[PDB]
């Protein structure tokens, strides 16, 4: 049923109804040449470079457009469909400016190749060419738009994938130029994708203007650590320094798109970077020194102190492996004072059941939702490729989005229930109007951002939301595998840390001050040296000198996610593996080894000595860590609620506000981001 | 007449590889993704297994990149996942296969976006 | 010193090389030479730039000197053209 039988040259590939001519060719195995058609962008038919010849038909048809019918034979390599490409390519090239040795989409051109494969050997355009006027679309995208083949992919993406709706066509004839009518910069996250989506090199990346050329770039597939969506990405390295980071497709997490932060902050990765292990001098000024000396500075203090006296405050962007190597270590000194900077409420079941702290509705589940209750977070600037998810599911499907936060630019039409945590109780009472909407919904989903939890009444906010999820679930009678409650993070090493049993919040360190603290990539201000005991002996374990370095008795440089085979996990627990794109710089070493080595100098040696062994260690403390690309299906929401019901807390009237109110808030957050000259240029452009 | 051996063909002893690069080298079997830059999918067809990346220190005299790892630039191409796994086992290199992920079917129709309703 | 100012430094371990042997650097740096080039005034909205000499120049490109605000600069010669 619903299987149209059509012959792609005689292969009778039976396709579902509504399959476009092009889609049938894909299934049979072919790939019709194409300029204006992108899988996740609307069909436009602008180029008509895809003209094919259905058998027994007078004219050739537009592949991307004709829904294939029954009995058709899509002759693709006919004598006609080649004159329908040999003659289109004649036109695209005719008005094209031949500056291919300027166009940094040199080997990354879908127009030279298609020319070299579906085009003609020579030109007949003896007439003159046209020229358009380069304008400014911002500090990230260089629009040398005399290159544009008016394929309108940008105008689509800028409207359909991102809700900018700014880029547009202006004029008619051969001087239709697809640029902003007034010069207003294209400022939005998801902005850099235009580069990747324009097959022509008209608008390309300005930082990566002319640093390389694609054949040279060695491409290593790794994971996004800047944000907690854990978007898949490919790090393009030449002769050992990263030259660009461009998206690689993951259906569920980032489907071909990556954030503006995680593709222009590769520059931040190359400066203010720690490399040699310095140690404080007599005058207090830090001074370089060999590992042996720096490690025993730390080891000697570690042997002297014990229990509460020693602590860790793991920062963001720290790999899971390093985490388990820091816990084992501080556990052998009788200390469970292992704390992450982002406070996740842990008075009821927290960290114990693995659903209190994970989006239980997988990102691809935003597509099959019905009503989303965004509470206290700006997805646009905390998980940009999850904001897109709710963008697509509000457009192609029909999600009814509701926000209980600050009224904020969300790239879609949301319902602003209010800015007061109290309203949560209101809906729980059912008194609130939206109650009906939720009631009407069959597959609903609440999403509590981590930043709402970071306030003082965060424990109360989680409990209040869990009560509402409980009766939302009861009133809707939603099926068990549909999961209403989920919470999204904004720090890469938070789900991994909570997974390994790291207890969130520095609240424990606050009550009893540790003699020694091993900051592990922590650039947050959660504990300061004035706050620390008199000794204030703390040793920074990280890659960039930002806030923790200048207040550090020891500097043990580490690596970054471009420089180690570590594991990370995003918000719905999908563990993922970063691969080493570039060897770590200077004497700097992998985070897990520094801690295995410090343990050997200390004498409480950790069991693993190779990374497969540390992966085996992760397996004993936690399951997700070893199985990659695998979301964990079952969760235990019912017992979580019981403990939530026991917890009694007051939600203060102060409105819950996302810290990233507008996009300048977004550009600089983590260490690598802060160290970005490109991000800095972006910040001043906004200001 | 044929003889029976249940021993996984390991021929690490005949290949002639230095001991260090057979026991410390992890190779990954993966199908290459597509540079988002281009929309062609002819480079996402065959599986490839690639050895783990190693040191690339700058050269003092000319600043050229210098590498001490021989198996770095080597990427062997294998048509099917089963065959690539076999190469790792008999050559003795450790392997961590990544499942192919192919684009999910997506429903498209020019008429659908013309819908003012939605 | 050089074009991109290569300066093996007083503390580098490579400046050792020039000892008793001079360094290769360039006078008439190009960075300033086109800046020294007069702006080619034109009548037409768009103009070509063979680089001068056709086959012995650069792949011909047409520059849009359409805004006096900006003198088009052929990406190959760095020649500014004054509408």
């Amino acid at each position: 049923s619903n299987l149209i039988e059509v012959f792609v040259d005689g292969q009778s590939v039976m396709v579902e109804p509504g399959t476009t001519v092009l889609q049938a060719c894909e299934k049979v195995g072919m790939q019709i040449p194409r300029f204006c058609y992108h899988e996740r962008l609307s069909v436009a038919g602008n180029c008509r470079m895809c003209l094919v010849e259905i058998e027994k038909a007078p004219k050739v048809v537009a592949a991307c457009a004709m829904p294939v019918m029954k009995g058709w034979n899509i002759l693709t390599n006919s004598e006609k469909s080649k004159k329908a490409r040999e003659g289109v390519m004649e036109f695209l090239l005719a008005n094209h400016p031949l500056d291919c040795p300027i166009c940094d989409q040199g080997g990354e051109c879908d127009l030279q190749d298609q020319s070299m494969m579906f085009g003609s050997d020579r030109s007949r355009f003896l007439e003159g060419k046209r020229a358009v006027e380069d304008k400014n679309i911002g500090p990230l995208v260089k629009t040398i738009m005399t290159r544009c083949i008016q394929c309108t992919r940008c105008i689509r993406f800028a409207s359909e994938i991102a809700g900018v709706d700014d880029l547009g066509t202006t004029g008619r004839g051969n001087d239709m130029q697809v640029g902003t009518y007034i010069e207003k910069m294209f400022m939005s996250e998801l902005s850099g994708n235009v580069i990747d989506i324009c097959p022509v090199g008209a608008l390309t990346s300005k930082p990566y203007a002319f640093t390389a050329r694609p054949w040279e770039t060695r491409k290593t597939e790794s994971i996004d650590v800047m944000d907690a969506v854990g978007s898949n990405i490919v790090v393009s390295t030449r002769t050992g320094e990263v030259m660009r980071i461009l998206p690689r497709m993951h259906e569920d997490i980032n489907e071909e798109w990556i954030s503006d932060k995680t593709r222009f902050a590769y520059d931040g990765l190359k400066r203010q970077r720690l490399t040699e292990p310095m140690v404080r001098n007599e005058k207090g000024l830090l001074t370089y020194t060999s590992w042996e000396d720096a490690l025993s500075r730390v080891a000697g203090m570690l042997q002297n102190f014990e229990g509460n006296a020693v602590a860790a405050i793991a920062g963001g962007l720290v790999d899971a492996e390093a985490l388990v190597a820091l816990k084992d270590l501080l556990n052998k000194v009788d200390s469970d004072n292992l704390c992450t900077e982002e406070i996740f409420p842990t008075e009821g079941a927290g960290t114990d059941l693995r659903s209190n702290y994970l989006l239980n509705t997988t990102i691809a589940g935003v597509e099959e939702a019905d009503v989303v209750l965004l509470v206290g977070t700006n997805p646009r600037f905390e998980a940009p490729l999850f904001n897109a998810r709710i963008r697509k599911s509000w457009l192609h499907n029909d999600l009814k989005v509701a926000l209980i936060g600050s009224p904020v630019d969300l790239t879609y039409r949301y319902d602003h229930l209010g800015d007061s945590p109290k309203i949560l109780q209101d809906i729980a009472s059912g008194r609130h109007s939206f109650c009906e909407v939720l009631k009407d919904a069959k597959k609903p989903m609440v999403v509590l951002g981590s930043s709402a939890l970071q306030r003082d009444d965060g424990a109360a906010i989680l409990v209040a939301v869990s009560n509402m999820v409980q009766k939302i679930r009861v009133t809707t009678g939603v099926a068990a595998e549909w999961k209403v409650m989920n919470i999204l993070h904004r720090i890469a090493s938070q789900v991994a840390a909570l997974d390994l049993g790291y207890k969130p919040g520095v609240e424990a360190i606050r009550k009893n001050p540790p003699k020694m603290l091993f900051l592990l990539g922590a650039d947050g201000g959660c504990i300061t040296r004035q706050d620390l005991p008199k000794d204030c002996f703390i040793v920074y374990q990280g890659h960039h000198g930002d806030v923790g370095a200048p207040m550090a008795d020891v500097i043990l440089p580490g690596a970054a996610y471009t420089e180690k085979s570590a594991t990370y996990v995003n918000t719905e627990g999908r563990a993922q593996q970063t691969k080493v794109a570039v060897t770590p710089p200077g004497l700097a070493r992998e985070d897990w080894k520094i801690i295995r080595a410090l343990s050997e100098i200390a004498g409480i040696t950790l069991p693993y000595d190779t990374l497969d062994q540390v992966r085996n260690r992760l397996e004993e403390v936690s399951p997700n860590l070893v199985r990659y690309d695998d979301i964990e299906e079952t969760n235990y929401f019912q017992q979580a609620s019981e403990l939530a019901k026991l917890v009694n807390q007051e939600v203060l009237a102060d409105p819950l506000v996302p810290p990233q109110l507008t996009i300048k808030d977004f550009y600089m957050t983590d260490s690598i981001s802060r160290a970005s000259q490109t991000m800095a240029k972006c910040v001043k452009a906004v200001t | 007449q044929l003889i029976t051996v249940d021993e996984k063909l390991d021929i690490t002893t005949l290949t002639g590889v230095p001991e260090e690069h057979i026991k410390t080298r992890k190779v990954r079997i993966f199908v290459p993704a597509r540079n988002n830059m281009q929309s062609g999918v002819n480079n996402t067809k065959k599986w490839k297994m690639e050895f783990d990346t190693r040191e690339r220190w700058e050269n003092p005299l000319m600043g050229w990149a210098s590498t001490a790892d021989p198996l770095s630039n080597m990427v062997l191409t294998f048509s099917a996942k089963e065959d690539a796994i076999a190469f790792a086992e008999k050559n003795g290199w450790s392997y961590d296969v990544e499942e192919k992920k192919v684009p999910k079917p997506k429903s498209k129709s020019y008429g659908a976006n013309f819908s003012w309703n939605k | 010193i050089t074009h991109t100012g290569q300066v093996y430094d007083e503390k580098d371990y490579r400046r050792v090389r020039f000892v008793d042997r001079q360094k290769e650097v360039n006078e008439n740096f190009a960075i300033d030479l086109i800046a020294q080039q007069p702006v080619n005034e034109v009548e037409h909205r768009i103009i070509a730039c063979d680089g001068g000499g056709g086959a012995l120049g650069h792949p011909k490109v047409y520059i849009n000197l359409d805004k006096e605000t900006k003198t088009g600069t052929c990406g190959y010669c760095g020649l500014q053209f004054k509408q």
Partner: peptide
Amino acid sequence: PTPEQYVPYSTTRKKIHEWVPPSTPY
């Protein structure tokens, strides 16, 4: 038509720049 040896050197710059320790003692 009618001492001077070319010493080879890298002309690129420093690339990775390390974080200068604060000269202010603490």
